[PDB]
Design a protein around this ligand. Structure first.
Ligand SMILES: [Ca+2]
Ligand SMILES: [Ca+2]
Ligand SMILES: [Ca+2]
Ligand SMILES: [Ca+2]
Ligand SMILES: [Ca+2]
Ligand SMILES: [Ca+2]
Ligand SMILES: [Ca+2]
Ligand SMILES: [Ca+2]
Lengths: 172, 172, 172, 172, 172, 172
């Protein structure tokens, strides 16, 4: 038991280890989406840059949780990072819809983590999650919803002109 | 026989002279495409600038090979430069498709040159081709493929609006 | 089959997909080592920074291969990223020894890839590997060997003073 | 028939197409002369630079005529570019004498073009030729005559010292 | 056996040790030529500076090979450095002719080293030689050929004025 | 006999030629020591840099003597440069002890040269040696003695920590 550990429940420690794997998995999903748009038969450079940036940010979120685990006297335990479910993402609109779904799932996991921290009376963990994760998730979800709405209204994905213009004017 | 000539096969010397003519020919093809887009009844200024730049680069590639011939103690032998097969290039998409085909043909010739240099055990010639030509060709081919994909997805060449927007947003 | 694909063997395409997973795995190993040194009961900040930097570079190497796959007309196929074999890395010296072993293994895979590219007569792939990977590997291996030699000569890992001073004077 | 065409005779259009080929041919001749001086057994670097610059300028002259053709509503028609008559240019003095002869021939063609434009009452074409070509030709011819006179007076080409010094002091 | 050694053949290691001695020997030859031109009865300062610079570069080439030996896990083994064959170099032209011969000999040794690396399947060693040595040798040889041609055409070495002017205008 | 030679004895000329070889030999010894510290199984970078700098300075000393020989109307006569007696230098302390011994030997040769110049009544040669060599030697010897004393007092070479710290704090 760590000399620094104080008011840090075993259940919280385990849940943090799970969240770490989830963020690394999200990073992997975004990495796959990015390079799909880099294909010569897809070729939407700004969609590709958008998802690569998202991939790097998810990786950063995971490292922040690893830092928190050590700060509290807990111990990091890593697991395999599962490959994404899809290899081909279909279209710009489909990719954005999948990302929205992914983000809502990560948000659900964070809300469950917050409830657990509350039940265990760990105010430091509650504030950490509120401060660094909760608001970021809400902003991310609103942004993806906006994008999905615009692509649909423009006539994507049936209209190839729609996806080309969105890549230039919104993501560019 | 040149006082500088060393490990430079007669077959390699001849193949270099052939590659020189091929690059000059590619330069001529791009020059023709450029001014086709400058016509009052076509009028796509950025397509015109794009192909003119390609024309100048091909000319530079040829001069580099002429420099290499002299460096190795070989002798330059020039041939007529054949006129392009087409005078009218039809459309932006058609021109891009023809350029893709042209580049793949020049790439094939370079791969054959590399194989010959390998058989003759000329490591300097192999590295020269690898360094200055092989990677440039691969990048060029990927770029043209990307362009072709976008124009097709936008609805070219049937859609005149598609070619107008690509000229502004991608080539501009 | 991609409109850009030329002289790119199916076996090469598959080997590239395998190398991509291997680099991502190496990235994961370095990430685990980094945060082990961040523990309150280990506490060697410069060892931690050193391995985190290595982790980011391996991730970059993987992305470069993903870029190459698309450039040649090949198709990315991702696999699970296996968790590292160890959770606890023992000591600074032990971690450096494990990294040396890891790098020699990645080097072996690259040498095998180069031999395959040679057999398939793919000069572009051979040069890509030579240029971006082979020399980097040799430098990395020499650096790790140097570090291991110094730690051993200083009296690590039995001497805790040795690891503390190396962290400050060499890695700092 | 172009919507922009006005007072542009069919004979003028054809003569412009011929002049375009002539300028491209002159460019090719200068390119050949340039690299002859780059040979290890000739080695006069400033003669080489001088002729390469002339080659680029002739190429520019041709592009200007291509621009003019399109401006007037005419249509570009390209022909093969014939290889130069010589592969070996003998000496610095001989090359300068050949260039003088070449320039006087191009000048004759331009004077004939001007006479035709005059007969067809095309004041715009007459002024274009006067402005951009006639004075440039006269200056070029005077310059080459000066060079030829100096080389001869110095004792070229029998004197190898003469050509070496001219390369340094006049062309350098 | 070095902890860093991987895919490095014993024959390659030995050949590298031999190349090291050869470059040091070339350095010694150029050093001797340099100070010959510094004599009061020769007095060509720019010839002297030219050869001294060549001497320093050869020394640098040798150190680079020593660095490579250590990087691969090989062991440096030095030999006596033989004195040059001549003490008196006769003339500027004679010195340049001897240097051309020397460089072609060093080039032959490098080509033989490359063939050996190829037979032993050492892609890293092949690329190292290609990258740092092969192209430098070709440039060096072309430069010396150019110099020899100019001196001969000027009337060296019978003409003392020729060597004086070349020292000022080419080497100065 | 040189038109510039004045009061320059044949014995002095010969002794200068011998000193030149001795300085080149010292340069070779330092070069060998330098790269010994660059080995993966030694790895003391600052010891390596220290000896490489010494190697370059000895080479400079030799060139200065070659310059002096020509200034006085004497003639340079070079000899083979013998390989160092050792290939493996054992340790940092051992290398420093060997260098101290080497420097005292070079100093003895210089003192003998000065005595000869004195006997031949050559005031210019005496002052040259005093000015450029004698004081430099004394400083070099004192510096090496200081280093040897410190390494011994620290517990080298039995203590690997001692050599590591000296490399950082004194030579770094
Ligand atoms: Ca598993
Ligand atoms: Ca013909
Ligand atoms: Ca290469
Ligand atoms: Ca799985
Ligand atoms: Ca024809
Ligand atoms: Ca011996
Ligand atoms: Ca001997
Ligand atoms: Ca004095």
């Amino acid at each position: 038991t760590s000399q620094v550990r104080q008011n840090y429940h075993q259940d919280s420690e385990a849940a943090i280890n799970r969240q770490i794997n989830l963020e690394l998995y999200a990073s992997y999903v975004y990495l796959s989406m990015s390079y799909y748009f880099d294909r010569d038969d897809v070729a939407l450079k700004n969609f590709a840059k958008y998802f690569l940036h998202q991939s790097h940010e998810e990786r950063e979120h995971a490292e922040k949780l690893m830092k928190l685990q050590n700060q509290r006297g807990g111990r990091i335990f890593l697991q395999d990072i599962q490959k994404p479910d899809c290899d081909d993402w279909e279209s710009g609109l489909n990719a954005m819809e999948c990302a929205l779904h992914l983000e809502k799932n990560v948000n659900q996991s964070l809300l469950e983590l917050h409830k657990l921290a509350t039940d265990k009376n760990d105010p430091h963990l509650c504030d950490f999650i509120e401060t660094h994760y909760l608001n970021e998730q809400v902003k991310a979800i609103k942004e993806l919803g906006d994008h999905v709405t615009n692509l649909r209204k423009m006539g994507a994905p049936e209209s190839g002109l729609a996806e080309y213009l969105f890549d230039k004017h919104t993501l560019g």
